[PDB]
Design a protein around this ligand. Structure first.
Ligand SMILES: COc1ncc(C2=CCOCC2)cc1NS(=O)(=O)c1ccccc1
Length: 863
């Protein structure tokens, strides 16, 4: 049928790779994933097309709640009905529920239309005007992110009563069309030859090989003999590893490194000793090696796709038996692990276990005590599983059976513990499956908060079909917002040839699950395609002609029918809730920096003031570190909000969408501190002293009694960013990367440097901001000390959740960020959060650091 061919060409267009390239690989593991995941994703599609209307609202328009609500006061609301142009303004309470507001809107409509109404508030849902956002459920109004937002900014909520029949019509329009353990032989392989090798002919070539189970070496690394450097080196030898074949763990990977000697790395390549169907690998293997920067165990176990250039390493995995040798089944493993011995011991050794499991590296004798007491670890300290898995001898199949027997009876762990187990230092498939089992209780909101880390964890995976891929795909097919961001996180990495196969295969599986959503994502990629061409034209044009003429050239290019069709009426890749309707070509522009980023403005007749939104298209710079930094700041704001602390933060969206390409959400009514401190003449803010400019600017935007609230929004946000930048190690802070909103809210932009990357970043305190906190006064210790308390109270909330940040940053090592790769980078966080110390000692240390920042600020007050 021409529908399947059309869908296939559309999927190929969307994921940035033709589906024909997957079939051309003639790979059983690739094709068996494509069938298995297509079946799974079409099941989800059918389940979804039969959902109730409230469950389809939960799929498409998941609730956006205030972090305090998860797990009185007068309010003016405007409610219109779908199709109608007349609306009703009424004053309800922040503690009233949506159903009461719907009953009140149906009463006003029944009185206005002089008819006794049959419809009931149970048949309706409230849409945020011109938005893919809905208010529903038994939650008071103030609990919704939209109503709470309106309260802070003084604006009036505009809602539309959508009927159950119109909601079902959306659902209907959006339809998809119709034995190893008895082999004590030492492990060995044949190093046959090497092809396309480029190196200095003065030197010699060596091949180093190690056996890994995640990070720990299964045995000592072995090396080949030094051979003369050439394009075709030949060893023809047998390297022998000090490990039995029966003792090979299921997740064992043979890691190779090709290099030149007289240190000079040329290439690296890894492979799994067992295939995806559990069969031990035998035969001739060609390893298309990856360039080097010596063994790389964390690197992928798949060949370099560029075979017309990559250096090859031809090896032979010897046939250990006259029959196919598979990895033993769980029943065979549990039966062997069921016959161990429980460690009965005195309170003296029990005192050490109760201390070293709560208290971090271990001593050799301490590991002997953790393994001996493994049964007591399971029963009394179930959250110490990660310590026990690290003391388990993975190079001993009998010790792996003893561990797996305890794991299979181990109780489900809390999300914080499960997040730790996803780390690469726990590569066992059963340990990953148990960790996924304990993540299933994650709400859509927690899942969305750690989605970026879970996507990086896919890079650590050894096989295509994994529990994490199925978990992520299942949650994405059940929630259109998870699906949206899962698509973009994978799509942004298609240019990386090591993840392109897996990421493109998951994106195809998702696309089968939702034909409609793929067409919405295509519309987004179409706009990004024109933004790329539009940015290029601006880069070339701006270097020859002036800024006003290049901006008019940009507006002419934008006014072409192709650009008007592509750039308008789309969901925002930065927020599916936000509809980018009419491009306001007049207000679009670009910045004066080397990459000339585009500022695209949008408006909406339906959404009103909410519809006037902006996006920034950036091409040339990498946005991955900004996205992570902003996500961590967002996390801080959630944690602070859950303890009743609202520091008025501004975690705007940042979305990488391709190769050095991405979008940033524009924060309207905001300016940089540098622009405000330029002190232009004939402005409502022209100062006598430059220190007054920032405060005068606030006075113009916030007249009379509004200034009091504006100074308080500034102060709260200052305390939030001071702590955030100190904890995260953000440096390169200057007037042009600190912005302020007309409301008084301060915030940071340009997050290219973090984790002190490498000098320890001190606590920063600017006298220009201290002058605002002090309300213009020289001495105002009441206001300044209120601010020190906001810092202290925000810092101690973050320390309480310090393990969550550490576990998230550890998973993020997989992203390959230059300022995030080794223990040294994440050491910065342990220092900033002072996690080794007590709450009194860390607070004393934070006070000394804040005081040392105040003395530096007084070098400006002395002037
Ligand atoms: C890292 O680059 C950025 N990061 C954030 C923003 C934002 C701005 C205003 O709205 C919230 C986001 C903008 C940029 N990039 S830019 O070149 O457009 C820019 C730089 C400095 C001042 C204003 C604009």
């Amino acid at each position: 049928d021409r529908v399947k061919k059309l869908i296939n060409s559309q999927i190929s267009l969307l994921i940035g790779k033709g589906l024909h390239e997957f079939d051309s690989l003639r790979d059983p593991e690739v094709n068996d994933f494509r069938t298995k995941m297509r079946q799974f994703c079409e099941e989800a599609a059918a389940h979804r097309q039969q959902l109730g209307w409230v469950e389809w609202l939960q799929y498409s328009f998941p609730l956006q709640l205030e972090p305090s609500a998860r797990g009185n006061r007068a309010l003016l609301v405007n409610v219109k009905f779908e199709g109608s142009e007349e609306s009703f303004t009424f004053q309800v309470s922040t503690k009233d529920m949506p159903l009461a507001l719907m009953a009140c809107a149906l009463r006003k409509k029944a009185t206005v239309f002089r008819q006794p109404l049959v419809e009931q508030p149970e048949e309706y849902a409230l849409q945020v005007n011109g938005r893919h956002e809905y208010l529903y459920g038994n939650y008071p109004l103030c609990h919704f992110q939209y109503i709470c937002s309106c309260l802070h900014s003084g604006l009036t909520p505009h809602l539309t009563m959508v009927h159950s029949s119109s909601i079902l019509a959306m659902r209907d329009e959006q339809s998809n069309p119709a034995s190893l353990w008895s082999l004590e032989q030492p492990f060995s392989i044949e190093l046959i030859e090497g092809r396309k090798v480029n190196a200095d002919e003065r030197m010699k070539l060596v091949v180093q090989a190690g056996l890994f189970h995640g990070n720990e070496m299964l045995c000592k690394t072995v090396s080949s003999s030094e051979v003369n450097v050439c394009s075709e080196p030949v060893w023809k030898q047998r390297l022998e590893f000090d490990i039995s074949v029966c003792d090979l763990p299921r997740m064992a990977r043979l890691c190779f490194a090709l290099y030149a000697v007289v240190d000079c790395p040329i290439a690296w390549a890894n492979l799994m000793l067992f295939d995806y169907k559990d069969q031990l690998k035998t035969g001739e293997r060609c390893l298309y090696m990856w360039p080097s920067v010596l063994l790389n165990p964390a690197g992928t176990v798949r060949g370099n796709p560029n075979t017309e250039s990559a250096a090859a390493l031809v090896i032979y995995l010897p046939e250990v038996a006259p029959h196919p040798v598979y990895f033993p089944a769980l029943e065979k493993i549990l039966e062997l692990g069921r016959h161990g011995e429980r460690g009965r011991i005195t309170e003296e050794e029990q005192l050490q276990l109760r201390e070293i499991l709560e208290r971090g590296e271990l001593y050799e004798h301490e590991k002997d005590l953790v393994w001996k007491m493994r049964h007591e670890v399971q029963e009394h300290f179930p959250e110490a599983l990660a310590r026990l898995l690290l003391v388990t001898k993975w190079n001993k199949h009998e010790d792996v059976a003893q561990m797996l027997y305890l794991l299979c009876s181990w109780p489900e762990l809390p999300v914080l513990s499960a997040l730790e187990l996803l780390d690469f230092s726990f590569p066992d498939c059963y340990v990953g499956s148990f960790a996924i089992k304990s993540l299933r209780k994650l709400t859509d909101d927690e899942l969305f908060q750690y989605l970026l880390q879970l996507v990086q964890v896919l890079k650590y995976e050894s096989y295509l079909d994994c529990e994490l891929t199925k978990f992520l795909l299942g949650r994405a097919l059940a929630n259109r917002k998870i699906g949206h961001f899962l698509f973009w996180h994978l799509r942004s990495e298609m240019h990386v040839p090591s993840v392109a196969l897996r990421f493109g295969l998951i994106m195809e599986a998702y696309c089968r699950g939702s034909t409609h959503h793929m067409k919405v994502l295509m519309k987004q990629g179409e706009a990004l395609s024109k933004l790329k061409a539009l940015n290029d034209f601006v880069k070339v044009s701006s270097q020859k002609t002036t800024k006003p003429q290049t901006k008019e050239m940009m507006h002419m290019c934008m006014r072409q029918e192709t650009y008007m069709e592509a750039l308008s009426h789309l969901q925002s890749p930065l927020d599916p809730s936000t509809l980018l309707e009419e491009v306001c070509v007049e207000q679009c522009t670009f910045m004066d920096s080397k990459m000339k980023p585009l500022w695209i403005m949008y408006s909406s007749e339906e959404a009103g003031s909410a519809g006037n939104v902006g996006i920034i298209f950036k091409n040339g710079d990498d946005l991955r570190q900004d996205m992570l930094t902003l996500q961590m700041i967002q996390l801080m704001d959630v944690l602070w909000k859950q303890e009743g602390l609202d520091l008025r933060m501004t975690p705007y969206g940042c979305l990488p969408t391709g190769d050095r390409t991405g979008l940033i959400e524009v924060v309207l009514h905001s300016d940089t501190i540098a622009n405000i401190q330029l002190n232009k003449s004939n402005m409502a803010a022209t100062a006598a002293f430059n220190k007054d400019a920032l405060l005068n600017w606030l006075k113009s935007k916030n007249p009379g009694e509004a200034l009091d609230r504006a100074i308080e929004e500034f102060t709260l946000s200052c305390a939030g960013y001071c702590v955030a930048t100190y904890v995260l190690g953000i440096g390169d802070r200057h007037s042009d990367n600190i912005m302020i909103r007309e409301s008084g809210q301060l915030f940071h932009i340009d997050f290219g440097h973090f984790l002190g990357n490498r000098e320890r970043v001190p606590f920063i305190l600017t006298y220009d901001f201290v002058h605002v906190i002090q309300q213009g006064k020289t001495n105002n210790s009441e206001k300044f000390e209120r601010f020190r308390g906001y810092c202290e109270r925000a810092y101690t909330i973050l320390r309480r959740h310090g393990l969550l940040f550490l576990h998230l940053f550890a998973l993020m090592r997989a992203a390959g960020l230059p300022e995030l790769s080794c223990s040294k980078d994440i050491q910065y966080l342990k220092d900033s959060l002072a996690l080794g110390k007590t709450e009194e000692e860390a607070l004393k240390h934070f006070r000394v650091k804040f005081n040392e920042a105040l003395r530096e600020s007084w070098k400006t007050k002395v002037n």
